[PDB]
């Protein structure tokens, strides 16, 4: 399965965001196109889009920002043709940092939406 | 004491696995030989072999796969020479070392550790 | 806000310590001068100084060592003019390691005090 091929374009699973932004940067449109093509040619595959933030700001603010990040990715893949039935969008806010330091080297890694396939 | 030396060959304590595999690759036989020699020359030293998986698949499937990984390492150590110094347990996918959701993390979590007691 | 400018000297947030020491090395005085200047000119800003340790020694020992590290940074910034009402010093001991390996490089990374601004 290309989903389990570490050298497929699908091996990249994450979209990164600028500070206090849920704009999907154009440099991630190709990645979204690749995953969209996968989902449209594997109609029983479902993906969970998880939005995350860096630690700056309240838990409440970042739950909402993470949700906008996940919803922005879901919308972009919907525009690329993915049927809504194969996607869900959820927020982890700032609660599940990947990088655990307290400067921009960590925070940039945490302003992130992940495509998590149900396997 | 060699298990406290960050510079000993014994400081490497992990065996890594391919996707959905509990086969111990030949490249790790030298590591296992090193720890085997240590355990055979330190008869009261015990090791807990903990098996781990990446997050893909059910919790139940991954608990069983981590167990097979730990038992394959235990078996390979036994073949290198006493069962009374080893236990094998599975953490399934529950204790990821790398917390990301792609192969860069997952490869680090398909792993059995030698945990000295 | 210079506090969110990655090219500001304020971008650096961490002070690193030698084994079993809470001495603030002189190489960090310029960083603390920069954060002191920022705090003095932004009286609404509050910073939490979080002290950490590497894994060697007991939880109790390291809780206290982490506290001495955070207090050492707070005193250094107090001597640079920062009002005590804009700082708090707390300890995470060895409970929140950044680097999880068991080697000199991981240990050095965790002998650390972080300036965490409330945002
Ligand atoms: O504002 C933030 O915390 C962000 O951009 O993740
Ligand atoms: O299938 C898995 O989750 C693995 O290989 O760890
Ligand atoms: O002794 C230690 O644990 C240290 O320096 O953090």
Distances (CA, A) of C58 to C34, C55, C64, C68, C89: 34, 8, 10, 15, 21
State the method. Answer: X-ray
**Contact at CB, C119 and A19, closer than 8 angstroms:** no
How many whole angstroms separate alpha carbon A73 and alpha carbon A24? 7
Give yes or no for a contact between B105 and B16, defined as CB atoms under 8 angstroms apart. Answer: no
Q: What CATH number should be reported for the domain whose range is B1-117?
A: 3.30.1330.60
Give yes or no for a contact between C72 and C15, defined as CB atoms under 8 angstroms apart. Answer: no
Q: Measure A105 CA to nearest chain C CA, in Å.
A: 10
Task: Give the contacts of B24 (CB within 8 A, at least 6 positions apart).
Answer: B15, B17, B32, B72, B73, B76
Touching chains, C (3+ CB pairs < 8 A): A, B
CA of B109 to the centre of ligand 2 (A): 8
**DSSP letters for B87-112:** EEEE-TTSS-SS--SSHHHHHHHSEE
How many whole angstroms separate alpha carbon A17 and alpha carbon C12? 21
State which residue of chain C sits closest to A103, comparing Cα positions.
C13
For the stretch A44-48, contacts whose Cβ atoms lie closer than 8 Å and that sit 24 or more positions apart, written own/partner, are: A45/A3, A45/A86, A45/A117, A45/A118, A46/A86, A46/A87, A46/A88, A46/A117, A46/A118, A47/A86, A47/A87, A47/A88, A47/A115, A47/A116, A47/A117, A47/A118, A48/A87, A48/A88, A48/A90, A48/A115, A48/A116, A48/A117, A48/A118
**Contact at CB, A104 and C50, closer than 8 angstroms:** no
Give yes or no for a contact between C16 and C108, defined as CB atoms under 8 angstroms apart. Answer: yes
Q: Would you give the end-to-end CA distance of chain A in angstroms?
A: 11
> Would you state the structure tokens that stand for residue C84, as one six-digit string?
């005590």
How many whole angstroms separate alpha carbon C100 and alpha carbon A107? 19
How many whole angstroms separate alpha carbon B76 and alpha carbon B71? 9
How many whole angstroms separate alpha carbon C50 and alpha carbon C1? 22
**Contact at CB, B103 and A11, closer than 8 angstroms:** yes
Q: Between the CA atoms of C71, C73, C77 and C78, what dihedral angle is there, to the nearest 10 degrees?
A: 20
Distances (CA, A) of B40 to B33, B34, B36, B44, B83: 10, 10, 6, 9, 11
Best of C69, C94, C95 for a ligand 3 pocket test (most atoms within 8 Å of beta carbon):
C94
CA of C114 to the centre of ligand 2 (A): 36
Pairing outcome for strands A47-52 and A87-93 = parallel
For the stretch B92-98, contacts whose Cβ atoms lie closer than 8 Å and that sit 24 or more positions apart, written own/partner, are: B92/B52, B92/B53, B92/B59, B92/B62, B92/B63, B92/B65, B92/B66, B93/B52, B93/B53, B93/B54, B93/B55, B93/B57, B93/B59, B93/B62, B93/B63, B93/B66, B94/B59, B95/B52, B96/B52, B96/B54, B96/B55, B97/B52, B97/C100
Q: Which residues of C touch A103 (CB under 8 A)?
A: 11-14
State which residue of chain C sits closest to B96, comparing Cα positions.
C100
**Contact at CB, A98 and B102, closer than 8 angstroms:** no
Distances (CA, A) of B52 to B13, C62, C86: 13, 29, 45
Alpha helices by DSSP H, listed for C1-119, are: 29-40, 59-78, 104-110
Secondary structure element (H or E) that encloses residue C12, with its range: none
The minimal CB distance from B19 to the residues A4, A114, A116 is found for A4
Q: Tell me the sheet residues that pair with A48.
A: A88, A116
> Would you state the structure tokens that stand for residue C96, as one six-digit string?
């929140």
Q: Measure C104 CA to nearest chain B CA, in Å.
A: 8
Residue B4 CB coordination number (10 Å):
10
Q: Between the CA atoms of C66, C68, C70 and C71, what dihedral angle is there, to the nearest 10 degrees?
A: 160
Please state whether C5 falls in left (phi above 0), alpha (psi between -120 and 50) or beta.
Answer: beta
> Would you state the structure tokens that stand for residue A40, as one six-digit string?
């449209």
Best of A14, A21, A57 for a ligand 1 pocket test (most atoms within 8 Å of beta carbon):
A57
Cβ of residue A100 closer than 8 Å to a chain C Cβ:
yes
Residue A11 CB coordination number (10 Å):
15
Nearest to A91 by CA among A119, A110, A117: A110
Question: For the domain with range A1-119, which CATH number is right: 3.30.1330.60, 3.20.20.70, 3.30.420.40, 1.10.3720.10?
Answer: 3.30.1330.60
């Amino acid at each position: 399965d290309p989903l389990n091929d570490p050298n497929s374009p699908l091996a990249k699973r994450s979209i990164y965001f600028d500070f206090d932004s849920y704009s999907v940067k154009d440099e991630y449109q190709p990645l979204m196109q690749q995953h969209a093509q996968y989902l449209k040619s594997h109609p029983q595959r479902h993906v969970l889009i998880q939005g995350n933030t860096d630690e700056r700001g309240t838990s409440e603010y970042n739950l909402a920002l993470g949700q906008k990040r996940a919803e922005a990715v879901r919308r972009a893949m919907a525009l690329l043709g993915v049927n809504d039935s194969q996607m869900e969008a959820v927020s982890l806010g700032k609660e599940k940092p990947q990088a655990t330091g307290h400067d921009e080297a960590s925070w940039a890694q945490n302003r992130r939406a992940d495509l998590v396939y149900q396997q």
